[PDB]
Amino acid sequence: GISRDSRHKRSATGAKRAQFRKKRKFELGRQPANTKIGPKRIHSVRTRGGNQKFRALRVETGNFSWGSEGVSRKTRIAGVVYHPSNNELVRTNTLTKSAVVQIDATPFRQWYENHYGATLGKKKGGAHAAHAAEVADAKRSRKVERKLAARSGAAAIESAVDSQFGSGRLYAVISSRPGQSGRCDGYILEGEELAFYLRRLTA
Amino acid sequence: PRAPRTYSKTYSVPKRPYESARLDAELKLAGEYGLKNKREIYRIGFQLSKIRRAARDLLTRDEKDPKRLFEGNALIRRLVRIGVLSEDKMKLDYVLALKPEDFLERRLQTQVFKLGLARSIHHARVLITQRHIAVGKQIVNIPSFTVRLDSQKHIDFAHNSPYGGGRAGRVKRKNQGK
């Protein structure tokens, strides 16, 4: 079937190579998972040595890390917005490694407000204004307020990340290989890497 | 399969088949020692030709060379042991001087005749082939058996031979038994 052998190629000098031997099983390839977004569907693959691989054919959620905050949460994946390899993966919402996706921001917002006491997005709407006061008026003990007060000053995050919380969706890049491990994990875009992909998206 | 078993030829024929000088020398040499055919002369010349080749290779090496001293002494010792080389000629230069008659002297057939056990050299071969001659306490029926120096004194009739104290042979038992 699909073969990874180098015998079928022509040499560096351009010479066609004669047929040496029949295709061997230890040089096989298989077909791409083409992971989509949908209710979870994972198929196991029996690989060399009796080991196991997992084809993620469909996933909804994944484990995403906030690198600056050192916190990881499981959150939904909304869709694929950019792919450096093929634009057809963006059009068809195909999850591969290094794909830029939008993830649900609520688990990280919940951690942030509970950890610092402030709010994110900074929108001025009525719901945003009511929620901003709601978090600031939350009932806490004296020790908790002091614990939050110690964490203050470090609670100011980058503007380009804070701004995203208003839409309820953060930009992230997939770090795992869904067709190899069945996981669709990644990290939240930050710093100049986020600035790089922001220019790509707006164009 | 099993490992191959080594074998090799023990003679080599002359390059020129017809040469009166060589033909007369061979026949003269075969008649003196009662040899069956020319191959028994080729065999001596062949094995003497490779003794010389070994000696020539060592003689090209420098004196006091470890290989020349070791293999040269071993080659001399073997030739002295079978009586081909004299005890006063252990120099590896006298090895090259050896001649085919030196080796034919040391055959069992030659020694049986020269020890008086046979009337002629041709009587010696049939005595050997007919299991009458024993070296030590072992019967040897190979005429080309090369007698060693320590085996020289123990050549005699087999103890169970008619000529050496055994019973009378087939012919006599049939005659005196009639």
């Binding site: - | 399969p1 099993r2 470890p66």
Partner: protein, 260 residues
């Protein structure tokens, strides 16, 4: 081709087993075990070809199935078990203890040892590293894994294994002046002291060894086994000959005097 080989042709067997050409088509293929195939001695070869206790391969299996043969203090019933360097073979029925140490001719000597010495063995440290939960361990030349070693032990050192508990009694650091036996190459079986270790980053380190007769030879560090803390003080009994290589002329002279 499609999987592991299970046969060993007689001609392709290691030459130090000293097997004859014409006894058959095959040779005992050593099992997987503590020692490499090329550097081992199957118990069938030891019990039949060396000791000549068994007359054939059927009889050596009968011997081992009665629980007589012990390698390193444990009963082995595998006739092709790969016994190797420094291994102790015990036959308590005959009250005999052997250690597999190379003689100077390159073969495994039939070296009988006392019961007190048969209670331990030496192993060359191949690597030191940390296992799971951060527990350091040592891998010896015979595949042993000893946990919690002395933190001073490094590679190329020699440890003394208690061989009944498997622990380390004490060790010898690899350094100049240590007693050494060579376990590979054409200098296999020779015994001398380290004179100078010559390093080659990215390549093979070379060790200069001086014989007791002040003969100097060079060998790879991978073929060097420290067996003593200094000259004349080995931690195991050496085989007859003391690992001193004689020239062929010297051997011929020695044999002449021995036989008269």
């Amino acid at each position: 081709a499609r999987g592991p080989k299970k046969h060993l042709k007689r001609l392709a067997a290691p030459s130090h087993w000293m097997l004859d050409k014409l006894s058959g088509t095959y040779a005992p293929r050593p099992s997987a075990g503590p020692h490499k195939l090329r550097e081992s001695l199957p118990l069938v070869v030891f019990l039949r070809n060396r000791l000549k206790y068994a007359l054939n391969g059927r009889e050596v299996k009968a011997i081992m199935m009665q629980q007589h043969v012990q390698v390193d203090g444990k009963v082995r019933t595998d006739t092709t078990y790969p016994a190797g360097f420094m291994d102790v073979i015990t036959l308590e029925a005959t009250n005999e203890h052997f250690r597999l140490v190379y003689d100077v001719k390159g073969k495994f000597a039939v070296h009988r040892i006392s019961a007190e010495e048969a209670a331990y063995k030496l192993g060359k440290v191949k690597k030191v590293q940390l296992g799971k939960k951060g527990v350091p361990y040592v891998v010896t030349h015979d595949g042993r894994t000893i946990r919690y070693p002395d933190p001073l032990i490094r590679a190329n050192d020699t440890v003394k294994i208690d061989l009944a508990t498997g622990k380390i009694d004490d060790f010898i650091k690899f350094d100049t002046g240590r007693l050494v036996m060579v376990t590979g190459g054409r200098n296999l079986g020779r015994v001398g002291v380290i004179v100078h270790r010559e390093k080659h980053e990215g390549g093979f380190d070379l060790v200069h060894i001086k014989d007791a007769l002040e003969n100097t030879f060079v060998t790879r560090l991978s073929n060097v086994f420290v067996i003593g803390t200094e000259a004349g003080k080995p931690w195991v009994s050496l085989p007859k000959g003391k690992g001193i290589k004689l020239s062929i002329s010297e051997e011929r002279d020695r044999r002449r005097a021995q036989q008269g």
